[PDB]
């Protein structure tokens, strides 16, 4: 599941040569999410004489 990410940086206007100081993106950590299952079991009984 992706996260929020996020901004960029505007050029300093007069920067035309190598490099123009273009920043970089926000590091999108592509985090795992997981599930779990529980069990229920119900039992009932009767006897032949009843």
């Amino acid at each position: 599941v992706e996260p929020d990410a996020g901004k960029a940086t505007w050029v300093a206007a007069s920067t035309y040569g190598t490099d123009t100081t273009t920043g970089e993106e926000v590091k999108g950590a592509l985090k795992e999410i997981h599930f779990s299952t529980y069990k229920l079991a119900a039992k009932s009984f009767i006897t032949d004489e009843t």
Binding site: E24, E25, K27, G28, A29, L30, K31, E32
Partner: protein
Amino acid sequence: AVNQSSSVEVSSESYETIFSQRIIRDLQKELVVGALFEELPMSSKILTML
């Protein structure tokens, strides 16, 4: 670690990797005393002879 790079591209933690369904086993000691001597068939509990 598993989580590489981190400037700047999208990279995850663990559970990216492919898994395999084959099973391997070490070279166990050869079987010889369990498969050498002759069987005698019986049909009760004790056998007697003279």
